[PDB]
Amino acid sequence: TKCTLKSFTVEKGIYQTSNFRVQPTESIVRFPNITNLCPFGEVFNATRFASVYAWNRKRISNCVADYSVLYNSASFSTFKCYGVSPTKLNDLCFTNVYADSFVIRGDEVRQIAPGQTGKIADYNYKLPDDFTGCVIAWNSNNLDSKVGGNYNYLYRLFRKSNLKPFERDISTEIYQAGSTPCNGVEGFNCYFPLQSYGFQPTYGVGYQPYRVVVLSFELLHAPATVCGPKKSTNLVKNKCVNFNFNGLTGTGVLTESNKKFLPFQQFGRDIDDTTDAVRDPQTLEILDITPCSFGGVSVITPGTNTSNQVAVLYQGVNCTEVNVFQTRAGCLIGAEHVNNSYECDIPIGAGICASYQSIIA
Amino acid sequence: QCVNLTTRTQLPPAYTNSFTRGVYYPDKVFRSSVLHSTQDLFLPFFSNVTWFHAIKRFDNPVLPFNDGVYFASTEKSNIIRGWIFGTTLDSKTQSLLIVNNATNVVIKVCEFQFCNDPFLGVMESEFRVYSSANNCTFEYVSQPFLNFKNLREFVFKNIDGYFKIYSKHTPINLVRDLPQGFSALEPLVDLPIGINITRFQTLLALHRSGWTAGAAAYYVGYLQPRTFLLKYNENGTITDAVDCALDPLSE
């Protein structure tokens, strides 16, 4: 009070000195139930993969993409992400996901990157320099190699020009390396551009088949629907917590509600358009949001000439949320309530007054 | 597969009064016993809505979408099954298909080649609404939405790449025109489509015994940007509304 009044002597009276803030204790972040996961089973766990010249592109939309399952797997040899970090993949949201799947050699995994040069980059699969996504590769000697030799995987060996980014070339026309016309027959200076791989299980690690899945993340002006799985903190009631329900955030005490919402309604507003009721997304129940008991802190004191005893009034604050007495004005601490009635010396409010005789109310 | 329908009878389109229909919930927010003023695409009160019949009448034209579409249906025996949404209605651009067949409702955003006269047929064993589907960007299968006995109100909006479908089912017993009353349309589904739509076409179902058109009637209204004053009761349903630009009393 001396600090607020800028004086070392305080006259008898009540002085509003501060404000009492209930501090938030927990953070409650409830978003909808984790359902409709993205079809990563049909990409990673596919029985057969495509050739690199005819790489499969799968469009992933309208689902929840859990990237932590892929990142924490020990089954992948390469998980190199370009243009984004793996840690924030599980949080961000994208409009569509392009999953390109193919099989290449062990030594050719390095060429699946922006700015690289090689047979795969120039003639089979070209990545843009400004690429946002991740390149995942793993050894598949167990599945894609047979003892006789697996010749079901093809790659383009020759093309007149380098491929554009995200281009698929499935043409089977004879490559013309010379001035002479090929005439459709494979003779001299004219070679068939698609050549088969010969995967065998007894091969070296640089020649063993590797399954590569490249995920391309783009953002377009359409509503982004491939989002990460927002985690849900367990619900805590009857305490002043910071709530985040389906992107609506605030601070309040969440108590049970008797308001019967219609099934399409999620939040509740009063006359002043402030959210005072809400529906929990995980469990369809209605919760009232009571604002935390913020109040004014007033100091009731007699003159410093008489005594140094003081009392504290928390305005509009119940006594269970802070010589403690409950008044309609608020909670009064440091004053002894008496049943006798005297003239008003220091006004407290709601018919309550304080005086010095100790400090009585 | 496409079939031209050449047995139609030429007739001018009808017009009628909207009365106090076309109101929908602007948001997913509960409000109790309060009056809320909102600025949104709303249908004007007592406006001129176009009236189309199915009786030999088979009205399936292509109409401009404008800023939103109010679809009213005085329906018996479930002739009306879905809608056609797009800009050019061909494979050049991307179009939205809404269909309700005998089992479920299917919503697809793809590059479709639409027929000039698309329809279904009734056991339901005739589907002649498209010839191709090339590049799909969104698929969504949901629960089925559905004297004239049923009144179906729908509101379609394209705002910020969001497609809002609002709907209401009403039990009516009026023979010919729209009944006069108040019924607020609940929001049914929001679609992440992100596509341009400027034209639409209704999808009907044929009755086969050539073809026969079942008795149905529908109304098209256009949404305009305006302000409504909505009344919310104790239970939180919109029971009455005021159009702020209709007359000075409501203003």
Next chain:
Amino acid sequence: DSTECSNLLLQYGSFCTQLNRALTGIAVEQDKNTQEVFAQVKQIYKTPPIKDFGGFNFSQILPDPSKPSKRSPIEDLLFNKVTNGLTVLPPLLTDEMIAQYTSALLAGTITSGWTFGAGP
């Protein structure tokens, strides 16, 4: 509850203190207004138990013993006919004490004339 907002708000100085002080002045002014209007007597007068006033009836303006609020029928009718950092401070004088002050004024002006306003 934004800490960055409060840190930026501190750059603007003592605007918040001025607004709080002005509102506090208004709040104490309302109590002073009520004190000036109603608390003009320091003796709480009561009417005699027998309401023999020479034919004059004051039942509509005297407090009703049947009512818990100790208000007059006219006062009861009057009370029935009147229907983010924000707090509402309660008034210093409750409605019961204001009704008691009006009752004291009525008892003084009925039993003592204008004498109670100028002395004993």
Next chain:
Amino acid sequence: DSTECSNLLLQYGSFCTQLNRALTGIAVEQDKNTQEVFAQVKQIYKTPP
């Protein structure tokens, strides 16, 4: 008459409604003041000829 200005002005809320309300209150207050000062009789008295 600029529609862009009004669209930007709507971002600031109901300041204009408050100012219009205050001016309307002052305007009706002036008529109330004149009514209170001069219209203290409901009978129009006339002097004898």
Next chain:
Amino acid sequence: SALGKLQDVVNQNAQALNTLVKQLSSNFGAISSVLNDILARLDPPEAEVQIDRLITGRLQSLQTYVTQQLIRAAEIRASANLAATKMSECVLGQSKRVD
């Protein structure tokens, strides 16, 4: 309409409070009216500017509310002084003042 004078005061105070709450939903030229959205969607160099715009708009609204409350407080104080004068002169005595 017998008790219109008290009802007008109650309506004006409630309406002013309602307007003060509704001024929070206005962005005042910022990208959003929510501080959390600005803090989460932008870096501190531009979030500082947007928060500053919200602060100046809300501060202007609060100053407007306090100013109009002060003017209404002056009016109510004048009315209360008149009421105290009527209490002293009409109830506690007989007044010769006409009307």
Next chain:
Amino acid sequence: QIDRLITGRLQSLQTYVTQQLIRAAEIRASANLAATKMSECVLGQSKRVD
């Protein structure tokens, strides 16, 4: 540019409305005094000095 002009003009208009409210309060007090004089000096004889 319109944001700068809007904030300047809004501040000017708010200042004008505040001045008008204060002057209206002063004129209301003067009118209440004038009504009191009309009641007590014209419609009756007043014993109040000056």
